[model samples]
Target: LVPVYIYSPEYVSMCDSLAKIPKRASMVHSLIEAYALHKQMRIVKPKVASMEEMATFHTDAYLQHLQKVSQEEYGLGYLCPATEGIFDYAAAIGGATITAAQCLIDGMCKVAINWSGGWHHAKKDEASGFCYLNDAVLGILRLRRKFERILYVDLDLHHGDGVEDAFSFTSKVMTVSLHKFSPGFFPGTGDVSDVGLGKGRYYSVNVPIQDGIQDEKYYQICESVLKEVYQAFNPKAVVLQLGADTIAGDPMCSFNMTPVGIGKCLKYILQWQLATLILGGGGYNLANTARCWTYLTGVILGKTLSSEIPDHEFFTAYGPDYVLEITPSCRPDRNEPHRIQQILNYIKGNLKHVVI
Candidate 1:
């Protein structure tokens, strides 16, 4: 069985006035708890990442700012709340990612999943988009020195600006982001032309897709891009950010990918024989969030759940009155066919020479 490590305790302190925010975290925790109890897989706890280790990817100034904000009890733009225990929680999640990466390198397993990690918007010197510590960047940096190249794939609805920026000038890392980007978006940065500089040109690939992308189109894009990924980089390791915001009912974004689509992507990665570290990013709808993550874990273990709605036991944990009424079959309606074609064309047109 594949080993999956999660940070449910870290999410216990993620408080916000927005119901969707807390619900998003709740979905991850509840599903893992259920999976553990059902004997589907083994669960492990992670230690807090050290400040010194964080410095490997984040700037000292940024680390100092986080320390000051935590000590002074201030929040960052409402995305991150100032709470007594948030710092420890964030550190533990980061440490969990580090642990997952180490395990992948040692061949203890082919895949490692960290549900509370993948805070992709934290910068080298600033915290943006609800991320205090950039665990994704730190984890990649921790392994980059040991490998000739690393491939970082992000499926968060929002662009992975910080991850791209952290490695924009280096050729040793290739960052691919498939996210939503239009006018008036958060952390607006991932443009098609924003390829890395100097030796890193074309190392950064961004597919800024429109709203309402479906399972067929989503899987098509992933297959096409990954073909290029293997031919060009042949990365020693891969870090995939499986943010649930791409789901159809997510309150945060407009993508319409079903759980089946997401599972297919994971399975494709495994077929490549590339060691992978998986992390969750954005998903707000409580029911969809729980179901999506549960589907992911089930896929990793080579067991995909049926389309039937989750039973009472899974639903009751969210709340006493909570009952999942939606079907588990993840065949979302295909919307925005034109936009999907354009996205596929863009990737193919730009990366034609890179693919074998």
Candidate 2:
């Protein structure tokens, strides 16, 4: 079994103190700890990332601005407000992500997770969306230094623009993001036409869908494209961002993904047996966020924990059914069969360029 779950109070504390967006690191961290204690599993703590290491993916000018200025000067506003410990917080998140990245690169673990990472919307020079620093970008850069090929898979509600943009013209890493795309959507960028350019053409795959994408359709699109990409890319290492905001009732986005939906995607990726780095991204509905990630932690560890969630410090936070699982009830599936196939066809057509 791999170290599917990695926790750190140091990073967790940073997130707690600098939480402007619904970062929800503490709750998810708490849930992981609770589950491990309930299941009697050991937990490993990750170290804080250093400035020198962070500069690998970030620019010196941007880092300097980020360190000294707390204004919107460095695009540090809104969800990524200029909080007191903003740089350290982002570094801590990057640290945990790099730790998992290192483990995967060195073959020390088959699948390692740090829900602390996955600030996917942040860019190399500027912070965007609710993210201050693009940790996934950093993780991929760190892994690419050690391996010939790397693949980044994003299943978040919003587009992973920061990461996809970082390697948009390179063949070193293949970027795939499945998310809801629209003109007015937040961070609005992952169109099917936005595939990579020049040397990186077709290496960046974006499968855009609409709201109310249920399990069957979501599963079909994910498995179909991912399977093809896996074979075509045959990547040496993989970094997967599992954002819980895609779940049925999240406030930020719309989707009908259950724990099973999320698990199916994960298991399919794990089946490839590549050096995989599992991470957490956007999840607003804190209770469901906790449930979704907790369930995933169990899946990665191959533990079949009972559906019944035991009492925790924030037990009341989980209301109504309050079980480890969620009801199948969700928004009706609006994904047209033809639309789904067209997206698949676009990806399949693009993937050919990578295999050769």
Candidate 3:
């Protein structure tokens, strides 16, 4: 059985205004409630990460600066607004990830879920993109010395610039990101040619998709690229960022992947027989976020729920019941052929000598 670790500090932390709804931590709690009600997996609370553990990925100067700034103000650079609760919330989530990583290393479980982690845009010495501490980087750093190879996969709508930048000079870690990139996007970076510098060349892979990419295309690309990843690195462990922003109707970015397709991606990774640590990333719409993550938990536990939407009791407690207000339809139009050939062709052409 997969032991799932959830950080509930997310629910306790609320924004000062409704306009900042896109970055709510309670979004994770609602998903936990749904998954709990369904009896999909065992739930456990995670401890708060120590400043020392966080310093493993972040610099001392940056950590001191964040501590000072978080205490003095309610926002970080206008990108990540905060209430008084953000410091504890971010630390708790980081601790949860460290716990998940330890569990994976001990072989107590094949997979561990930390729904509060995956703040990928945070740098080694700076915080950006709503992430104050880079939990993913910390966890990877914890394992890199012991493992021969590590693969970091980010599925958020925006690129994982921080994680890519952190391991940009090392060959021990391979970072792959699939995100939305066009002119004038926030923190715009992830280009296909931006592979890595020095020993990290070809270790970084980015697939920037355009608008209106549905699940058929998304999964097709994942299947091809992940297979190539396995053949190239044969990593001992993988850390995947399951950001819900890629779903249709998310206000953050424009991409289309139904909950079912996301489940398929999870199941595919499980089949590879590699140890995995799954962390939640960016998800704005509360209902969609809960549904997709609940579906993912269900898949991980080998339990599937009926197509029926969750009841009202689940939503009203957290926020408005968007599930009841909106029609419960699968987001992907799977019948339409996704232009996967072009994306796969591009990846294959660029990575031919490396992977094949």
Candidate 4:
């Protein structure tokens, strides 16, 4: 259920300046629900996360600071602001994710999803990137109360720093992020050498990718890494982050990943069959983001939907072909083999010290 609509219109209003992210979930929900296929699924409501759970992952000082000012402290400006109802909005997103995760934990659903979640850039005392709350970390922390070993795979164009930092000293969660890492890239953290820290050392994995990483090579890199980590960690649960920014033509992104590669990544992870919670992250191209998540929603629901987007309110947004498809670019692949080898060697070397 990757297109689960778990939030309210009032909450959506707060996402106005979130750089077109609000429409991503709502668009996927609209696209899928337009078809008769949606009626076959169960509809559930997600409760707002309580203050205790918020404080459990975020510091009280940070929480109080968030409430007290109009300042952009903790990166709360254009990327992430302390807008009105933002606190509740963030909590609702976290709650929806936690609720989806709980469905997996309680056996209510083999796979549950919160496409509105996956805010992986927030820190304990600060908000980095566009994330105000690290829902991925919060969900993992919530899951750790029940499961011992959990694997987290982040597919965003940027690193999942907040989530990785949240579990930097622990071994219960093995965090892996595949991103385009350059010196000028935003945040600039997930290096191949930064595998976990302390007891969590060797538990984290980073695949630093580059621009123009088209479908085949990108899938090969992701598939190879996932195979090794899945076997090495044997996580009881898996949390996947499908950020559409990796798609070609995202205004702020560099890589040339198409929706074709994204589905492969999600489908490959689903093969493991661990209690899975799927989350959404950065995706700026509204049409492609909608298309990718809608296609992924179909994948999670076990339905191979038609190439035609069908009749939907937002059908006009797809433009020219108006299909649920996007093509990978032949942009002269710039992925360096040695760079990928470095990632492979680093992960293989570190996995040896990782206790499944």
Strongest candidate by lDDT: 2
How accurate locally, in lDDT, is each candidate? Answer: 0.72, 0.80, 0.72, 0.79
Q: Residue 269 of candidate 2: its Cα lDDT?
A: 88
Q: Which one is best on TM-score?
A: 2
Residue pairs whose backbone atoms clash in candidate 2: none
State residue 181's C-alpha deviation in candidate 2, in Å: 0.7
Ranking by lDDT: 2, 4, 3, 1
Write down the TM-score of every candidate.
0.85, 0.94, 0.86, 0.93
lDDT of 1: 0.72
- Model 1: ten consecutive residues of lowest lDDT: 11-20
Q: What is the lDDT of residue 176 in candidate 3?
A: 88
Off by over 4 Å in 3: 8-27, 35-40, 73-75, 81-85, 310-312, 316-343, 349-356
lDDT of 4 by residue, 1-356 (tens): 33333445544444433554755666767776775555655556777888788887899988877766633366777777676666766778888888877777677766777777888999999987878888998888888877889889999998998889988888889999999888889879988999877898888889888788888888889888888888888889888898888888788658888777888888898877778888888888887887888788777767888888787878888878888878766666677888788778778888877655
lDDT per residue, candidate 3, 1-356, as tens digits? Answer: 55555544433352212234444455545554654643545555576788888888887887666666557632266786644556665677778888888877887777878876788988877668888788899888876755678889998888999899999987788898988878888678987777888877788888877766676667887888888887877888888999888777687647766777777777788888777889888888766777777777777777756565555445553344334222323443433344446656666765654642
Model 2 residue 179 CA deviation (Å) reads 0.6
In model 2, which runs have C-alpha deviations exceeding 4 angstroms? Answer: 18-23, 37-42, 70-72, 328-330
lDDT by residue (tens digit), candidate 1, 78-124: 77665455566567768888877877777777777787678998877
